[PDB]
Amino acid sequence: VSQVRQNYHSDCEAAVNRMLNLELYASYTYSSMYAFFDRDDVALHNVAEFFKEHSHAEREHAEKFMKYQNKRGGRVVLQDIKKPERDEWGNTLEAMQAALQLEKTVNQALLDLHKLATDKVDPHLCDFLESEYLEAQVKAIKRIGDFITNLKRLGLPENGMGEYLFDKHSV
Amino acid sequence: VSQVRQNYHSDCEAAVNRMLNLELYASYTYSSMYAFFDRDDVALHNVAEFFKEHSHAEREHAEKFMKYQNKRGGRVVLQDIKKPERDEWGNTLEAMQAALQLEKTVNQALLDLHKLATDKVDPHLCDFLESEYLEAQVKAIKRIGDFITNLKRLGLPENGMGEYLFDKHSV
Amino acid sequence: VSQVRQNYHSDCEAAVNRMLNLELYASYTYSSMYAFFDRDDVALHNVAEFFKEHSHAEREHAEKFMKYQNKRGGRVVLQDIKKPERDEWGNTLEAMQAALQLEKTVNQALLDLHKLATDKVDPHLCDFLESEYLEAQVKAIKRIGDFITNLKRLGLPENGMGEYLFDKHSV
Amino acid sequence: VSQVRQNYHSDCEAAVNRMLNLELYASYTYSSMYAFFDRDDVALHNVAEFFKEHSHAEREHAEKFMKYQNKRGGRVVLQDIKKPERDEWGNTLEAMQAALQLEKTVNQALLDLHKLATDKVDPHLCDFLESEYLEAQVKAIKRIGDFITNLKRLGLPENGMGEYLFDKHSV
Ligand SMILES: [Cl-]
Ligand SMILES: [Cl-]
Ligand SMILES: [Cl-]
Ligand SMILES: [Cl-]
Ligand SMILES: [Cl-]
Ligand SMILES: [Cl-]
Ligand SMILES: [Cl-]
Ligand SMILES: [Cl-]
Ligand SMILES: [Cl-]
Ligand SMILES: [Cl-]
Ligand SMILES: [Cl-]
Ligand SMILES: [Cl-]
Ligand SMILES: [Cl-]
Ligand SMILES: [Cl-]
Ligand SMILES: [Cl-]
Ligand SMILES: [Cl-]
Ligand SMILES: [Cl-]
Ligand SMILES: [Cl-]
Ligand SMILES: [Cl-]
Ligand SMILES: [Cl-]
Ligand SMILES: [Cl-]
Ligand SMILES: [Cl-]
Ligand SMILES: [Cl-]
Ligand SMILES: [Cl-]
Ligand SMILES: [Cl-]
Ligand SMILES: [Cl-]
Ligand SMILES: [Cl-]
Ligand SMILES: [Cl-]
Ligand SMILES: [Cl-]
Ligand SMILES: [Cl-]
Ligand SMILES: [Cl-]
Ligand SMILES: [Cl-]
Ligand SMILES: [Cl-]
Ligand SMILES: [Cl-]
Ligand SMILES: [Cl-]
Ligand SMILES: [Cl-]
Ligand SMILES: [Cl-]
Ligand SMILES: [Cl-]
Ligand SMILES: [Cl-]
Ligand SMILES: [Cl-]
Ligand SMILES: [Cl-]
Ligand SMILES: [Cl-]
Ligand SMILES: [Cl-]
Ligand SMILES: [Cl-]
Ligand SMILES: [Cl-]
Ligand SMILES: [Cl-]
Ligand SMILES: [Cl-]
Ligand SMILES: [Cl-]
Ligand SMILES: [Fe+2]
Ligand SMILES: [Fe+2]
Ligand SMILES: [Fe+2]
Ligand SMILES: [Fe+2]
Ligand SMILES: [Fe+2]
Ligand SMILES: [Fe+2]
Ligand SMILES: [Fe+2]
Ligand SMILES: [Fe+2]
Ligand SMILES: [Mg+2]
Ligand SMILES: [Mg+2]
Ligand SMILES: [Mg+2]
Ligand SMILES: [Mg+2]
Ligand SMILES: [Mg+2]
Ligand SMILES: [Mg+2]
Ligand SMILES: [Mg+2]
Ligand SMILES: [Mg+2]
Ligand SMILES: [Mg+2]
Ligand SMILES: [Mg+2]
Ligand SMILES: [Mg+2]
Ligand SMILES: [Mg+2]
Ligand SMILES: [Mg+2]
Ligand SMILES: [Mg+2]
Ligand SMILES: [Mg+2]
Ligand SMILES: [Mg+2]
Ligand SMILES: [Mg+2]
Ligand SMILES: [Mg+2]
Ligand SMILES: [Mg+2]
Ligand SMILES: [Mg+2]
Ligand SMILES: [Mg+2]
Ligand SMILES: [Mg+2]
Ligand SMILES: [Mg+2]
Ligand SMILES: [Mg+2]
Ligand SMILES: [Mg+2]
Ligand SMILES: [Mg+2]
Ligand SMILES: [Mg+2]
Numbered sequence: 001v002s003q004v005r006q007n008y009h010s011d012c013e014a015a016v017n018r019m020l021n022l023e024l025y026a027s028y029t030y031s032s033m034y035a036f037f038d039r040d041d042v043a044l045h046n047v048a049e050f051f052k053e054h055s056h057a058e059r060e061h062a063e064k065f066m067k068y069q070n071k072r073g074g075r076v077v078l079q080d081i082k083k084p085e086r087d088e089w090g091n092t093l094e095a096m097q098a099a100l101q102l103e104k105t106v107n108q109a110l111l112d113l114h115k116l117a118t119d120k121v122d123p124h125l126c127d128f129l130e131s132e133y134l135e136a137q138v139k140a141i142k143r144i145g146d147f148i149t150n151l152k153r154l155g156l157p158e159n160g161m162g163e164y165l166f167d168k169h170s171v
Numbered sequence: 172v173s174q175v176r177q178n179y180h181s182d183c184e185a186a187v188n189r190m191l192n193l194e195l196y197a198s199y200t201y202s203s204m205y206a207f208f209d210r211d212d213v214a215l216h217n218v219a220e221f222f223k224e225h226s227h228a229e230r231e232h233a234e235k236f237m238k239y240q241n242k243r244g245g246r247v248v249l250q251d252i253k254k255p256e257r258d259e260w261g262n263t264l265e266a267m268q269a270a271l272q273l274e275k276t277v278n279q280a281l282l283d284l285h286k287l288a289t290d291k292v293d294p295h296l297c298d299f300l301e302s303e304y305l306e307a308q309v310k311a312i313k314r315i316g317d318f319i320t321n322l323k324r325l326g327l328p329e330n331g332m333g334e335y336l337f338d339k340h341s342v
Numbered sequence: 343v344s345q346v347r348q349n350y351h352s353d354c355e356a357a358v359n360r361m362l363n364l365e366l367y368a369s370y371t372y373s374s375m376y377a378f379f380d381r382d383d384v385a386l387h388n389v390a391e392f393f394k395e396h397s398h399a400e401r402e403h404a405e406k407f408m409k410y411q412n413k414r415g416g417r418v419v420l421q422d423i424k425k426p427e428r429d430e431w432g433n434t435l436e437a438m439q440a441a442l443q444l445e446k447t448v449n450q451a452l453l454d455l456h457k458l459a460t461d462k463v464d465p466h467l468c469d470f471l472e473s474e475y476l477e478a479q480v481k482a483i484k485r486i487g488d489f490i491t492n493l494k495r496l497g498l499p500e501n502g503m504g505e506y507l508f509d510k511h512s513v
Numbered sequence: 514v515s516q517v518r519q520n521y522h523s524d525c526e527a528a529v530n531r532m533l534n535l536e537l538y539a540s541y542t543y544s545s546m547y548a549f550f551d552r553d554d555v556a557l558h559n560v561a562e563f564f565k566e567h568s569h570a571e572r573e574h575a576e577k578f579m580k581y582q583n584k585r586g587g588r589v590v591l592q593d594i595k596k597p598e599r600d601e602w603g604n605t606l607e608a609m610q611a612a613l614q615l616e617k618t619v620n621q622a623l624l625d626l627h628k629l630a631t632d633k634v635d636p637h638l639c640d641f642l643e644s645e646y647l648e649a650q651v652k653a654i655k656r657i658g659d660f661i662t663n664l665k666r667l668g669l670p671e672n673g674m675g676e677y678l679f680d681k682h683s684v
Contacts, residue, residue, distance in 0.1 A: 100345065100346075104348055107348055107349075108348070111348075111349055111465070114465045115463065118465075126465070129465070130465055130466075130468070130469040131469070134465060134466045134469060135466065135469065135470075138413050138414065138466055139413070141346045141348070142211055142346055142412070142413045145211040145212075145214070145344075145345045145346040145415075146211055146214035146216070147214075148345065149211060149212055149213065149214040150214055150335060152331075153331035153332070153334060153335055154331060154332055154335055155331065155332060159332070161332070162332055162335075165332070165335065165336070169335075169339045170339075173382055173383060173658075174382060174383070174613065174658045174661065175382045175613075175654045175655055175658040177617055177620055177621070177624075177654070178620075178624055195423075199420070199423070202405075202408070202420075203418070203420055205408070206408045206411075206412065206418040207418075209408075209409065209412045210412055210417070211344055211345060211346045211412065211415060212344060212345070223405075230401070234373075234394075237373070237376070237377045237380075238380065240377075241377065241380045241381055241382065241655070242651050242652070242655045243651065244382060244658075246381070247374070247377040247378075248429060249370070249373075249374055249425045249426060249429070250425050251422045251423060251424055251425050252366075252370070252422060252423035252425075253422055254420045254421050254422050254423075255420060258419060258420070292628065294624070294627045294631075294639070294642070294643055294647060295643075295647045295648065295651055297643070298643040298644070298647060298648065299648075382655055382658040382659055382662060383658075383662055384662065385658070385659035385660075385662040385663055387659070502665075502666035502667060502668065503666070503667055503668060503672070503674070503675055503678070505666060506663060506666055506667055506675075506678065506682075507678070510682045510683075
């Protein structure tokens with residue numbers, strides 16, 4: 001047992017490792033979206049940069065779980081980072097729809113971890129999730145939803161002019 | 172009788188209280204429009220902010236009548252602030268049309284109060300309306316009319332691209 | 343269903359709308375207290391300004407619930423803002439006593455909403471209340487209680503000199 | 514006839530001369546109040562300074578009517594400035610009560626001049642009164658009324674401690 005460990009259930013330690021992996025998975029998916037929008041036959045550079053920045057943020061989310069694990073006396077256990085679900089992302093609307101789903105998947109995992117922490121009577125882990133993750137998730141989901149609404153208003157997927165306008169004025 | 176009261180008719184005092192209520196009603200209507208345009212399925216944030224700012228201005232208009240009432244020795248009497256006429260505002264054109272009508276309703280009440288003040292030979296109240304309210308109303312009405320003209324030119328309500336363009340370049 | 347909605351119970355959405363209304367009600371009550379203390383026959387301007395500022399803060403509390411509702415994918419539903427309980431507020435002690443009661447009423451509604459959020463397993467809503475509302479309420483209640491104690495020490499309601507001194511040195 | 518004169522009735526010209534005299538009379542009354550509160554056996558120096566400043570403001574009001582008269586092509590006609598009604602002013606409450614009455618007398622004369630200007634269809638004179646005099650009068654009356662309310666709360670005339678406190682914290 002780690003000399004620092006106190007009130008930290010094995011189940012929570014394991015679930016933190018799984019959550020770390022999911023953050024890394026999300027990072028990698030956003031990196032793929034960046035690369036897609038940077039293609040010469042896609043060429044929506046502000047959209048590409050949005051996804052590149054999102055990829056970096058998800059890596060920071062992962063690193064914060066690594067630090068957390070060690071602060072509590074748990075032990076970081078890494079698994080493979082699975083490649084993203086798609087190799088190509090269609091267009092800005094399809095990518096944003098996939099991003100919304102990804103953010104909701106991550107949010108559900110965070111909510112499930114909060115449930116576990118509650119069950120194991122771990123207020124420090126509850127606070128960490130509430131203070132560092134849950135509101136950031138709600139904000140990200142709202143932003144992407146707002147984007148999807150605008151992409152639909154702009155006539156995506158068919159309206160290429162609309163797609164151009166979005167990249168030039170929304171991101 | 173208030174020790175400060177001079178040349179202030181009871182009818183004018185009552186009409187100032189009614190006008191205060193109408194300013195608060197206008198504020199509340201604009202708050203509703205703000206909340207509508209901030210919805211994830213509407214997502215026109217510059218339009219939302221325009222209405223939020225308008226809501227704050229109407230509250231200032233109300234507060235200025237409260238201060239006026241007390242300066243003249245009248246007594247502020249508050250009534251319920253009725254909820255807005257609609258719960259949802261359709262789109263930018265419908266909302267701007269409702270805002271135009273609201274501003275004209277407020278303007279008519281101000282003009283009617285000026286008529287009353289004239290009838291009761293109250294030049295201080297006439298001056299207050301002319302110096303603090305009537306020109307602001309004319310300016311607001313003109314601005315909203317100009318917006319409606321542009322929204323129609325942009326093909327509202329059907330043209331979603333036009334609606335997007337308005338939010339990005341007119342507000 | 344809103345595309346952003348996740349883990350947000352209908353009961354919580356409705357209770358947020360009711361809480362929004364109560365914040366607006368509190369704002370309006372403080373506006374009435376402002377207007378009372380600004381009367382020429384009351385004339386306690388620092389007290390009036392305290393209540394005017396409190397009125398503005400309550401409006402901000404309401405606006406933050408509107409924003410919250412939309413972030414979660416709920417839909418803002420407005421109701422009439424009821425006029426305050428009194429048209430005149432007696433004196434500084436009576437007004438502060440009413441303010442204490444109002445703040446405790448608002449606090450109880452916030453605590454009840456936290457209970458509901460807990461029952462529905464909504465940690466984001468719990469965090470929002472804890473981080474943005476509950477401590478502000480405790481602070482406001484303590485401040486007003488401290489004022490009441492001082493007003494009683496100063497001999498309110500009978501001691502007009504005491505009332506004058508409070509306005510000049512406590513606010 | 515003056516080469517500049519246009520739409521300026523003889524009655525209005527005469528009434529402007531009478532109004533000028535009344536402003537000078539008000540100045541002189543406030544000078545007397547200054548001198549009273551500066552007496553070694555009265556010794557309320559902040560009150561004295563309030564009245565001295567008011568005396569200077571009334572002289573400015575008079576000078577503005579002189580300038581107005583000449584701008585319209587009327588001819589300034591001066592009369593004696595009558596000495597104030599009292600040689601001694603009792604105490605701060607009595608003086609403020611006399612000041613309130615004086616300001617209301619001046620206000621009534623301004624309102625009567627506005628009536629005359631209206632009757633003679635002189636919008637320039639109406640504007641001058643509304644823009645330069647009537648609101649200043651309402652503000653001054655409100656300020657003095659507020660002071661009287663506070664002096665009564667402080668137990669004037671009997672409560673010398675209250676009178677001291679007013680001079681140290683209200684002016
Ligand atoms: Cl442990
Ligand atoms: Cl424990
Ligand atoms: Cl364990
Ligand atoms: Cl593990
Ligand atoms: Cl894993
Ligand atoms: Cl694996
Ligand atoms: Cl693919
Ligand atoms: Cl997903
Ligand atoms: Cl879990
Ligand atoms: Cl967060
Ligand atoms: Cl936000
Ligand atoms: Cl289209
Ligand atoms: Cl009157
Ligand atoms: Cl009159
Ligand atoms: Cl009347
Ligand atoms: Cl009324
Ligand atoms: Cl009303
Ligand atoms: Cl009503
Ligand atoms: Cl509706
Ligand atoms: Cl209307
Ligand atoms: Cl009217
Ligand atoms: Cl104006
Ligand atoms: Cl203009
Ligand atoms: Cl069109
Ligand atoms: Cl849900
Ligand atoms: Cl859940
Ligand atoms: Cl539900
Ligand atoms: Cl509801
Ligand atoms: Cl309600
Ligand atoms: Cl209701
Ligand atoms: Cl009452
Ligand atoms: Cl209450
Ligand atoms: Cl509740
Ligand atoms: Cl708080
Ligand atoms: Cl504190
Ligand atoms: Cl006492
Ligand atoms: Cl002439
Ligand atoms: Cl003419
Ligand atoms: Cl003539
Ligand atoms: Cl003359
Ligand atoms: Cl004369
Ligand atoms: Cl004479
Ligand atoms: Cl005398
Ligand atoms: Cl007089
Ligand atoms: Cl006259
Ligand atoms: Cl003025
Ligand atoms: Cl003022
Ligand atoms: Cl006393
Ligand atoms: Fe993340
Ligand atoms: Fe994310
Ligand atoms: Fe207004
Ligand atoms: Fe308006
Ligand atoms: Fe509040
Ligand atoms: Fe409050
Ligand atoms: Fe004057
Ligand atoms: Fe004066
Ligand atoms: Mg060891
Ligand atoms: Mg273990
Ligand atoms: Mg996993
Ligand atoms: Mg594989
Ligand atoms: Mg917390
Ligand atoms: Mg937070
Ligand atoms: Mg946004
Ligand atoms: Mg009275
Ligand atoms: Mg009446
Ligand atoms: Mg009405
Ligand atoms: Mg109704
Ligand atoms: Mg103007
Ligand atoms: Mg313009
Ligand atoms: Mg939908
Ligand atoms: Mg529902
Ligand atoms: Mg309620
Ligand atoms: Mg009622
Ligand atoms: Mg908790
Ligand atoms: Mg806090
Ligand atoms: Mg304190
Ligand atoms: Mg000549
Ligand atoms: Mg003549
Ligand atoms: Mg005279
Ligand atoms: Mg004489
Ligand atoms: Mg006029
Ligand atoms: Mg003016
Ligand atoms: Mg004042």
